Design a protein around this nucleic acid. Structure first.
Ligand code: ZN
Ligand code: ZN
Ligand code: ZN
Lengths: 26, 69, 49, 156
RNA sequence: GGAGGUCAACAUCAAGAACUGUGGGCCUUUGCCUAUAGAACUUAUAACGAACAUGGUUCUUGCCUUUUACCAGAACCAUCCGGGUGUUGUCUCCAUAUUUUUU
């Protein structure tokens, strides 16, 4: 129920280019 | 069905597991010590499978495919 | 050797490494033979000590 | 043939251009296998998570050269697979449709787990987050056991 | 679809010279006789393995202070390092005329 632009918008907030980048905030 | 062949691991994974178990003095490794005692049933098989791939006089060094705990 | 054959068992036959492979606890890689020999010497010393 | 013996073959053309960057991963792996002693258990898992990350990044480098931007020759890429600079099977999983951001090959093996299912890093983030919002607690999965993967789904 | 895997599971591998299936008859299903279709692998100076180890029990010996550990022949049984072939799955790489023949 998400849109393909919103996934990239959330994904650019993610640190650390590969999978080992956090969804946490620090 | 659900079968998928066994993953090929990096060899530095085995090297770090070997190096980390050089000196084992913690409350951790209470399980790993019991594993070390458990593997001694299996040491003739490991010695056999090592020694029957002794390289040969015409080879410098050969890579073997190992299976570790 | 030729006088007494010892005639292998062709049924059930659980092998070792083929059943040690099905666990999640063993894993698999390829390393040089001399490295495997040195690791076996370290492990076999550590077990008996 | 990761060691260089007489049986090995000399390198194809473009390798001397990409020899230095691969060299970085080599020396960085020779910090990771170096036995820094740690008392804890989580801090001893952090080391293996670092090693699997370095192996993943080197394979992503050779993959993004040969397949995405087509910057190296096929004759060199077969050499890099032969000399074990790359993981052939992990790249084979990267070429599929559902798997592109895949961490490691123990997070898609169904046989290893207790009940069937893969590792939890293969789940999209939004599906975990809607289930955690439905139960109302929060999403409690920080970092995987096998890789240290933090959400290696294709959309994430 | 095609090639391949030091990938997995499941059948099968030592016996009237020896296999399975089918139809008909007799007995009352098993079995016997008769007609038919197929049989991969192993085997005749006999066996999967042009290779070859160890363990148990009971006899018969040899070293002889007793038990392990042993010496070396037999009989009966087991464990171990391996192998073939078949079916299914999975993984990887590419692909979508002048005599018998008739002149
Ligand atoms: Zn992952
Ligand atoms: Zn993983
Ligand atoms: Zn995971």
């Amino acid at each position: 129920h998400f849109t393909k632009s919103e996934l990239k918008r959330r994904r650019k907030t993610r640190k650390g280019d590969g999978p080992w980048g956090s969804w946490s905030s620090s | 069905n659900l079968y998928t062949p066994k993953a090929e691991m990096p060899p530095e994974h085995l090297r770090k597991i070997i190096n980390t178990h050089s000196d084992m003095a913690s409350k951790m490794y209470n399980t790993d010590k019991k594993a070390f005692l458990g593997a001694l049933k299996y040491l003739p098989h490991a010695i056999l499978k090592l020694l029957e791939n002794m390289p040969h006089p015409w080879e410098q060094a050969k890579e073997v495919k190992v299976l570790y705990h | 050797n030729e006088l007494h054959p010892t005639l292998p068992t062709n049924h059930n036959k659980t092998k070792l490494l083929k059943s040690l492979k099905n666990t999640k606890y063993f894993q698999q890689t390829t390393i040089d033979w001399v490295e495997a020999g040195l690791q076996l010497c370290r492990q076999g010393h550590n077990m008996l000590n | 043939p990761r060691i260089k013996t007489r049986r090995s073959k000399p390198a194809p053309d473009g390798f001397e251009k990409i020899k230095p960057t691969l060299t970085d991963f080599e020396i960085q792996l020779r910090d990771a296998q170096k036995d820094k002693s740690s008392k804890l258990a989580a801090k001893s898992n952090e080391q293996l998570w670092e090693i699997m990350q370095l192996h993943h990044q080197r394979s992503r480098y050779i993959y993004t050269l040969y397949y995405k931007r087509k910057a190296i020759s096929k004759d060199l890429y077969d050499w890099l697979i032969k000399e074990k600079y790359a993981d052939k099977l992990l790249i084979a999983k990267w070429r599929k449709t559902g798997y592109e951001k895949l961490c490691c090959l123990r997070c898609i093996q169904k046989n290893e787990t207790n009940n069937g299912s893969t590792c939890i890093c293969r789940v999209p983030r939004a599906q975990l987050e809607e289930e955690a919002r439905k139960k109302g607690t929060q999403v409690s999965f920080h970092q995987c056991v096998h890789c240290g993967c933090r959400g290696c789904a294709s959309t994430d």
